[PDB]
Amino acid sequence: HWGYGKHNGPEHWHKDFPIAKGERQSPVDIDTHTAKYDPSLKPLSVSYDQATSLRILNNGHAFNVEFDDSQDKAVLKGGPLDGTYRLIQFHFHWGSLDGQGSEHTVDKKKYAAELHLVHWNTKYGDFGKAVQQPDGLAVLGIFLKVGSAKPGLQKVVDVLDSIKTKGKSADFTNFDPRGLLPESLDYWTYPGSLTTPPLLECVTWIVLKEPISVSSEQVLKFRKLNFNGEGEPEELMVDNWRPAQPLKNRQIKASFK
Ligand SMILES: CC(=O)O[C@@H]1[C@H](O)[C@@H](O)O[C@H](COS(N)(=O)=O)[C@H]1OC(C)=O
Ligand SMILES: [Zn+2]
Structure with missing residues (x-):
């Protein structure tokens, strides 16, 4: 099926997933000088105090830190969002080199990686139903340099080290995602999509202006992961990012001047 290699990569997805060329695909390039400050946005509210992490999994495309979302334990509200969005998982996208890896770009600049915290609108009862709605998901994107x-x-x-290959998973309780946030919650926001198949156009993107810094030794360890399952030839997990897509009939709004 789909991947990031030469033969199954983002340039091919449209064949199985025609929405790949759709009205509101992600990611996109954020042109800081075309974005419009929007005084009517409410302050962003990240409420990760009761957050309950459960497990980390290598699914052959990325690794997912999964959260207990059977209740409003960790939610995102405010900003451009209507209602409550519950945290289900976070994951990263990164490069084979520090000059690339992010999905969203800022004035065409690529960051070394990009963290995504994925939330779903609780009005829809479950993740599966929420991906079928234009306001189903809220993904909080954070740049890594x-x-x-x-x-x-x-x-x-x-x-x-313990989830090197596809399918592997480890326990991962008591992780606090607040440690991944920058100091400022200034952001850009636009309507978009999942950046992997099925590429459903159900996402309100919230991309933070301020990057977090990580060490070269930290990112190197991301790059020791494998796309492949255990006992197979080694395909290093790198460059699992979709390039920027056309903005088309959309506007990016800023929470700041
Ligand atoms: C459970 C799972 O497979 O998560 C996916 C995974 O974390 C990652 O490859 O990005 C996808 C892309 O989502 S992302 N980039 O839009 O926020 C995720 O897909 C979805 C449906 O959450
Ligand atoms: Zn992602």
Whole structure:
């Protein structure tokens, strides 16, 4: 099926997933000088105090830190969002080199990686139904640049050795996603899609202006993961990012001037 290699990569997805060429695909390039400050946006509210992480899994495309979303334990509200969006998982996209890896770009600039915290609109009862709605999901995107270490990320980095290959998973309780946030919640926002198949156009993207720094040693460990299952020839997990798509009939709004 789909992947990021030369033969199954994003340039091919449209064949199985025609929506790949759709009205509101992600990611996109964020042109800081075309984005419009929107004074009517409410402050963004990240409420990750009761967050309950459960497990980390290598699914052959990325690794997912999964959260207990049977209740409003960790939610996202405010900003451009209507209602309550519940945290289900976070994951990353990254490159084979520090100059690439992010999905969204800022004035065409690629970051070394991009963290995605995925939430679903609780008005729809479950994730499956929410992906079928134009306001079904809210993904909080955070850029990673290489520099000094992010201590809050290190717990994640150390467990990757135990989920090297596709299908593997490890326990991952008591992780606090608040340690992954930058100091500022200034953001850009636009309507978009999942960035992997099925590429459903159900996402309100919230992309933070301020990157977090991670060390080269931290990102290197991301790059030791495998796309392949155990006992197969090694395909390093790198460059699992979709390039920017056309903005078309959309506007990006900023929470700041
Ligand atoms: C459970 C799972 O497979 O998660 C996917 C995975 O984390 C990652 O490859 O990105 C996808 C792309 O989503 S992302 N980039 O839009 O936020 C995720 O897909 C979805 C449906 O959550
Ligand atoms: Zn993602």
